[PDB]
Each structure stands twice: as structure tokens, then as C-alpha cells.
Ligand binder design. Structure first.
Ligand SMILES: N[C@@H]1[C@@H](O)[C@H](O)[C@@H](CO)O[C@H]1O
Length: 857
């Protein structure tokens, strides 16, 4: 590692060697140049200890079976060292270490001098700016962090709640970059742009702020100058030796600003701020950043629901709870791939319940137009002062400035990312008055001006007040009609802001299953859903798949083998996730107690999982993924499980007219039993709706039957197709048996007729184009080629290599399609040509009642 002396240099440390403090008897020795490190583990930047150990071989893949249980965790109850050399050719410039992401805390050492202790460098989110100029010399220098064990119940850090299983090291280590900064007499810090747009969105005012600190021995004059949004700015201030000042620039007007919008509502432009602090007509330090020109509000409606708006347009939040990797393994491409899946699902938002990602994650969210809802997490140290018998320790005096500093450092990091639409200062429990005041003060000090939400539950805080949100569950199996409930004011139906809910178990694709679980584990899964599954949750409540398995059997019919269990799981998950979203889209425009938000629990999993996910840890796409994608189409037709109304939803930024909605019921033998064609429908922009028809009680339906809903635009183009498998037997709730995480059923729909749906046929041609942008698009033309009346039902197309392995990540325009005899659809999948790994592409096509084939693409 070499760092130049250039003013404004800020170079990330690319890697470390690590070893347990068990092997280090003299702490001061480690950071002396020449300290031997034989047997130490080389690890990349942003590594937890265990991730470093995995990078070196040292344990088997924790994504497979119970491999993670075989790691001795005692070794992580003592500190580990992160060490690097640093070459400095020229000590003319001052030298700083600027970092955050230390879990839980650290002593910091340079060339045999302890520059900071774990009392100062404490908390995952706290930022540190350590001037190490006195310690640095020309040639080989050495830097070492003694990183202390992490306990999320004790430390203001990150924990995993009940999402997965506990990482053996509790994620101890350094999970963001440590920057080596160089600068002259004056350091430049905290440069940012306060931006205020008018209601017409055609003029903005910019107030640039930046701090300058004179770390030299003598008084200086400094000039802070550069550009904001293409316009020149310059201020000159005096600084005493050791003085820090905030420089405020005179207001800058910006006409016809290139306003940042959420995806689909306009562009995702960010402007640049570029500053240099100069001393004696020579640069001393420099900083470049971005900001977006966007207004956001989050207010309580007349029903008490939290209602977001961006640039004066109200939105229904449609999102998922986002999580990083279980061992905080960072990959910039992977972050991009995950946020891109958000938009392929048609979602608009992700929630981060703690685990707040490095800066690049928010850069990508900004660039893609994905809204973000960061905040502190429940159920550990963060809520320890207010959450009673729940996990997390009561706070002592030294906790208060760590929390406040954590808030200041996150507010400072997040304030100029336009994707950020709020910060949750509480999750579960709202903070008390003292803690809340600390957070509000930190945010004001950082000019963090975004909406503050006191909790994701219905709990108010003393100052900010009512949350406008609810956390009533469920987190486990409930039938599709559950989501249409508005009668139960303590449950999770479509009304108010649903900040975290799902129907629990989300079995991944067979391809993923075979990568995460052994033959014997998979066998238990379908034979005994009641058995604990390591790849569900460490929580007793969510340790097994019983509620899911019982419902699947009741409602699909008993599983005959593993393949049967999996195919049925995919329908149940598509059916459920679809209803969850669709109910919330429908009730968004209710006059009273509308739904104002939905955060699916969860978008994704920290690892290979059996629950709470839309896409799995390998980026594969199952029935839950496809069901969410179906429900969130920009021009969409849907069927209401409560009242049988056919409803059109327009997610787009423009009102649409001249639509026709066609609804047809079929028995499983293919007989049409009902048809309705509703022409001339209009529907307003940004989540508004129109009712096409209420399907009547039709006579002579098979016990399981099909509803085919089709929306066509005024040109005649089919813009949405949506096929439901329905029963003449209702799912109904035993509401009085409700617990915090689910409501049991008093009767079960009968969808078991699908077991005996006759065979149909498809019908497949595929071709691929490798583009100059490094992507390949594969186009597949599917046709129901059968000679009878039977639809080809639930046809899943997968891009695969020559070995039949899924090419991932992948983005389809549509998938999991249903085609009546003689009907054709053309589907389009896009992925990185490089992810084929030299293979020609093929397409695996599997339908519920059409078998499996692969065709060359
Ligand atoms: N905010 C938490 C989530 O993190 C958790 O997964 C869910 C299910 O236990 O409960 C909520 O209390």
C-alpha cells in the first residue's frame, strides 16, 4: 500500500492481514514496521473476521446445510487484529485515518503508538477522523486495529434478530473502508448541499456548506472554492491554529433543475459538488460529491396513516425489507444486481431495518431511482432502553454519546442521497425523550432534513409523535383473503402503512434447494414440515415450517414427493405474495383508512433461506418472486379475493384511457363458465384504480377453477394478463385464535383439483443477441400447441447453460405465464454475457401441466 502526498488524496486500505489477539502478547508490537505476521490471514477490505476466514479456506460454505454450526465460536470472544503496512514517500502532507464500520469497537495503533482506544472508536456507525501526522514517517509505516468482539445486545452495532442464524463471529471486524487521507495545513470535511425546490419544481435554491479545520501550528487564511451544479463558488475565512469552522456559501439559484424522480416518474439525475480548500495559493484538501434536487414529505393522513410524497406526488410505498449478506461480504456489482431486481419486481422502495449499507449502495439506489427507508433496528442494543424484556441491554451513560454520534455520522452520510425518503429513529419501540432528543439534535447538526419516523410499529415517540405505521404481523402463513381485511384493527390487512409483513415460508427453486440442503434435509422438509430447519430461523417461533406445511396440504393436497411439495410451494407463494401486494394497491385510494404502504418481509435473505424472501441468496426467482412481479405491473389487472371485483391499477405517471378488461372463468376441463368484457375504462396515474366488474356467483364451477383476467389497451395490445386458481370453498379466518405473528384458519380453500388438471403442451422457440453493452438478451416464443381445450398453466422459463444450470442474475419482462390453446407469448430475458461463462445459452421450460423441455437459445 503506497499513498501519494497530493492534497485531497483519500485512499482506501485494500486489505489487511488478520489474527486473533490470542497470538499477540504485546499489543504495541503489532503496528511496528517489521512485525512478523507468519500464519496471519490475508483478507480484503470490508471483511468481518469470519468472512476473512472463509476467504482463506478455513471453514466450509455456511450456505450449505449445518456447516456454520461446525465453527467454534469461542475464538471470537477475544479481540482480533487487522494489520497493514503503509508506504509514505513524503511526509510534507498531514495524514489521517478516516473510517467507520468497526464492530464493535477498536484500539487503533500506528508505528507502536496507540492513537485511539476502544472507548473512543466504538459503535459500528461512528465515524473517526484520526490525525496520525505525529506518528507517520517516510518509508514503511504500519497501522493496526485491535477489534473487539461484537455482541449486538450490548453494543450499538448490527445484529440479526430472527432473520437467519447467528454468524459465529457476530460480524466482528471492519465492514467499511478505512481511508488514508492526505492534506496540508487545512482539512476539508462534511461538504454538502442543502437544496430547496419550489412547488412548481422549476427552481431550486442551493446552500453549500463545508467545514475547514486548521490542523497546523499557525493561523491561516483558507479559500474554499469550486463548483456546485455547474456554477462557481468561493469563500475565504480565517482559522486560528486548531480551529474548525463551518463555511456557508451565499445562496445559489438553479433554474429548470434536472429534478430527480423515483424510477418510472422521470430521470435520476444527480448534480456534482467539487471543492478545494487552498492555503497560500496552493490546494490543501479537496472533496467531490453528489446531490439530488428532489422534495420528499411524509405526513399523517386524516386516517392517521403515514403518507409519502416525492416532488409533491403522493405514492403508495411498494417495497421489501432489504438485508445485506449474513457475514457483511461487500460486492458493488451484487448490490447493483439486488437493487435492479427491485425494479424488475416493479417495486419502488426498500427498507433497511438497521444493517445500513456502505455509500455505494445509496449511490446505486440514487442512480436506479429506488427509494430507501433506512433506520435503526429492533430487538437488540438500539432499543435496549425502551424495549423491556426484549433482547438488548438498558443504556448506561457512555451509550448516549455513541448513539448520538452514530446518528450524526449516518445523517452526514445519507443527507445528499435523493433515494433516501426518511430515517426511522425507532423500529419496534419508539425512543424515549432523552434518546429522541439526541437523534433530533444530531440530525439538525448534520442538516439532515428528511422525514423522521419514530417507529415502524404504531408506537409514538414523545417529540415527533405518532408513527402513522403498524406492525401487527403476520410473519407466517395466512390465506390470500386475509390481506383484504379491514375489520381487525390489531391485524395486518391492507390499511395504514404495513412496515414489515409476509406469509412466512418462501421455498426457493429446486436449483437453489440442492445447493443449500442435503438430500436428507430436503426429505425431512416435505415429509415433516414440523421438523426444525437450520435454514429458516434461530427463533423458536419460526424454527420449522409447520403452519406452511399444514396449509399446503389442506389447500393444495398432500405432497406425494419432494417435487410435488416444491411445485405446490411455488403456487402457494405466488398466490399469497400476489394477494398481499394487490390488496394494498387496491385499498390505497380508499376514502377511509387507505393502505399507504407495504414492506414485504423480506425482499431478500442474508443467506440461503426457506423464508421471508422474494429472490434467494443466489438471485434465483421462484413463485414468490413472480407473484410479487405480477402484482406490481405498471398497468395491471387483478381479482379481489374478498368480494370478487376485477380491478385495474395504473402505477404509471400518466392517466390511461380506452382500456378493456376481459374476465373469463374456466373449469379445469377447459369449459368457459363466465365471460365479461368491460370496454372504455379510464384510470388515473400513480396508483389509482377502476373497477371493471364484480364476478357473480357462477353455477356449475369445478371445486378448483380458473379466472383468466386480461387487460388490453386502446390499440388492442395485451398489457396485463393475470390467471388465478380459485376454489368454490372459501378460506376463512379464526380471528379469535390470532397470535402476534399469524391468524389460524377455520376453513381452507380447496385448490387440490390442480393435481388432476390434464396435460397441455408448449410450444417453444429461442434466440439470443450478445450486445455491445456486455449484456445478452434471450427472446423466447412460447405457444400452447395442444389439440384440446386445456391451458398450459404456470409455464416457467429459465435461462440455463449447457449443463442446465440457471444463469443468474437474470431479468425477464414476464414469466410464469399461462396460455390458452393456440395462444403465443414472446418473453425477453437479459443478463451479463459473462455470466454464461463461455456456454451457449439454452432455455429450460417447465409448466405445471406441460412437463419440462430445454431448447437452444
Ligand atoms: N422488527 C422486527 C423484525 O426484524 C422481525 O423479523 C419480525 C418478526 O419477528 O418482528 C419485528 O419485531
Amino acid at each position: 500500500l503506497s499513498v501519494g502526498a497530493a492534497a485531497g488524496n483519500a485512499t482506501p486500505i485494500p486489505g489487511y492481514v488478520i489474527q486473533s489477539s490470542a497470538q499477540v502478547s504485546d499489543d504495541s508490537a503489532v503496528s511496528k514496521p517489521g512485525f512478523p505476521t507468519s500464519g496471519w490471514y490475508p483478507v480484503s477490505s470490508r471483511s468481518t473476521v469470519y468472512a476473512g476466514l472463509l476467504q482463506n479456506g478455513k471453514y466450509a460454505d455456511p450456505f450449505y446445510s449445518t456447516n456454520m454450526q461446525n465453527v467454534p465460536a469461542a475464538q471470537f470472544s477475544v479481540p482480533w487484529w487487522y494489520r497493514t503496512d503503509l508506504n509514505v514517500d513524503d511526509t510534507s502532507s498531514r495524514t489521517y485515518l478516516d473510517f467507520s464500520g468497526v464492530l464493535s469497537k477498536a484500539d487503533v495503533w500506528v508505528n507502536g503508538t496507540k492513537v485511539a482506544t476502544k472507548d473512543q472508536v466504538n459503535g459500528a456507525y461512528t465515524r473517526h477522523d484520526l490525525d496520525i501526522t505525529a506518528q507517520v514517517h517516510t518509508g514503511v509505516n504500519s497501522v493496526a486495529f485491535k477489534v473487539y468482539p461484537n455482541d449486538p445486545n450490548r453494543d450499538l452495532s448490527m445484529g440479526w434478530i430472527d432473520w437467519a442464524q447467528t454468524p459465529p463471529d457476530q460480524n466482528m471486524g471492519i465492514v467499511r473502508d478505512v481511508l488514508v487521507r492526505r492534506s496540508g495545513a487545512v482539512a476539508l470535511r462534511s461538504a454538502h448541499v442543502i437544496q430547496k425546490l419550489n412547488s412548481a419544481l422549476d427552481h431550486a435554491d442551493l446552500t453549500v456548506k463545508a467545514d475547514v479545520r486548521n490542523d497546523s501550528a499557525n493561523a491561516v487564511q483558507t479559500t474554499v472554492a469550486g463548483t456546485v451544479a455547474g456554477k462557481p463558488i468561493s469563500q475565504t475565512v480565517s482559522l486560528a491554529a486548531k480551529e474548525r469552522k463551518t463555511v456557508t456559501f451565499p445562496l445559489v439559484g438553479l433554474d429548470r433543475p434536472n429534478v430527480w424522480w423515483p424510477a418510472g416518474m422521470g430521470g435520476q439525475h444527480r448534480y456534482d459538488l467539487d471543492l478545494t480548500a487552498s492555503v497560500g495559493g496552493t490546494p490543501s484538501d479537496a472533496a467531490k460529491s453528489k446531490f439530488g434536487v428532489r422534495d420528499v414529505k411524509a405526513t399523517l393522513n386524516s386516517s392517521g396513516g403515514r403518507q409519502y410524497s416525492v416532488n409533491g406526488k403522493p405514492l403508495l410505498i411498494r417495497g421489501g425489507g432489504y438485508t445485506p449478506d449474513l457475514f457483511l461480504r461487500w460486492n458493488e456489482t451484487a448490490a447493483a444486481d439486488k437493487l435492479k431486481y427491485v425494479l424488475n419486481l416493479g417495486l419502488n422502495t426498500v427498507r433497511l431495518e438497521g444493517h445500513i449499507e456502505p455509500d455505494e449502495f445509496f449511490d446505486i439506489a440514487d442512480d436506479l431511482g429506488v427509494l430507501t427507508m433506512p433506520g435503526w433496528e429492533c430487538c437488540d442494543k438500539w432499543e435496549g432502553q425502551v424495549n423491556g424484556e426484549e433482547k438488548g441491554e438498558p443504556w448506561v451513560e457512555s451509550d448516549y454519546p455513541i448513539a448520538k454520534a452514530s446518528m450524526f455520522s449516518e445523517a452526514e452520510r445519507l443527507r445528499d442521497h435523493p433515494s433516501v425518503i426518511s430515517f426511522h429513529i425507532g423500529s419496534d419501540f419508539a425512543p424515549d425523550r432523552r434518546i429522541e432528543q439526541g437523534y433530533l439534535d444530531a440530525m439538525k447538526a448534520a442538516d439532515f432534513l428528511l422525514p423522521v419516523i419514530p417507529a415502524a410499529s404504531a408506537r409514538p415517540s414523545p417529540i415527533t409523535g405518532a408513527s402513522g405505521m403498524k406492525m401487527n404481523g403476520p410473519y407466517d402463513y395466512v390465506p390470500p383473503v386475509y390481506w383484504y381485511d379491514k375489520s381487525q384493527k390489531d391485524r395486518g390487512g391492507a390499511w395504514s402503512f404495513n412496515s414489515e409483513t409476509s406469509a412466512g415460508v418462501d421455498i426457493p427453486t429446486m436449483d437453489t434447494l440442492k445447493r443449500m440442503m442435503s438430500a436428507s434435509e430436503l426429505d425431512t422438509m416435505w415429509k415433516n414440515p414440523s421438523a426444525k430447519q437450520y435454514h429458516r430461523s434461530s427463533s423458536d417461533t419460526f424454527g420449522n415450517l409447520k403452519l406452511f406445511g399444514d396449509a399446503l396440504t389442506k389447500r393444495y393436497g398432500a405432497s406425494a414427493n419432494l417435487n410435488d411439495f416444491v411445485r405446490k410451494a411455488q403456487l402457494s407463494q405466488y398466490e399469497n405474495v400476489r394477494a398481499e401486494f394487490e390488496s394494498h394497491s387496491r385499498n390505497y385510494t380508499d376514502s377511509t383508512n387507505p393502505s399507504t404502504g407495504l414492506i414485504y418481509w423480506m425482499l431478500n435473505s442474508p443467506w440461503t433461506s426457506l423464508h421471508w424472501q422474494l429472490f434467494d441468496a443466489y438471485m434465483d426467482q421462484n413463485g414468490a418472486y413472480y407473484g410479487a412481479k405480477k402484482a406490481n405491473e405498471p398497468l395491471h389487472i387483478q381479482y379481489s379475493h374478498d368480494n370478487r371485483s376485477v380491478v385495474v391499477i395504473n402505477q404509471t405517471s400518466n392517466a390511461v384511457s380506452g382500456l378493456t378488461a376481459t374476465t373469463k372463468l374456466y373449469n379445469l376441463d377447459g369449459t368457459e363458465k363466465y365471460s365479461n368484457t368491460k370496454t372504455g375504462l379510464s384510470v388515473g396515474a400513480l396508483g389509482a384504480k377502476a373497477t371493471a366488474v364484480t364476478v357473480p356467483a357462477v353455477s356449475g364451477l369445478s371445486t378448483t377453477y380458473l379466472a383468466k383476467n386480461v387487460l388490453t389497451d386502446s390499440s388492442g395490445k395485451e398489457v396485463s394478463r393475470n390467471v388465478y386458481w380459485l376454489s368454490t370453498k372459501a378460506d376463512t379466518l379464526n380471528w379469535g385464535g390470532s397470535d402476534w405473528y399469524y391468524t389460524p384458519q377455520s376453513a381452507f380453500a380447496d385448490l387440490s383439483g390442480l393435481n388432476n388438471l390434464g396435460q397441455s403442451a408448449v410450444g417453444a422457440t429461442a434466440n439470443s443477441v450478445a450486445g455491445a453493452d456486455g449484456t445478452t438478451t434471450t427472446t423466447v416464443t412460447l405457444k400452447n400447441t395442444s389439440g384440446g381445450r386445456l391451458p398450459a398453466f404456470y409455464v416457467d422459463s429459465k435461462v440455463v447453460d449447457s449443463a442446465g444450470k440457471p444463469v443468474l442474475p437474470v431479468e425477464w419482462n414476464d414469466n410464469a405465464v399461462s396460455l390458452w390453446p393456440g395462444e403465443t407469448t414472446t418473453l425477453t430475458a437479459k443478463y451479463r454475457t459473462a455470466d454464461l461463462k463461455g456456454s451457449k445459452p439454452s432455455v429450460r421450460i417447465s409448466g405445471w401441466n406441460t412437463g419440462t423441455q430445454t431448447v437452444p437459445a
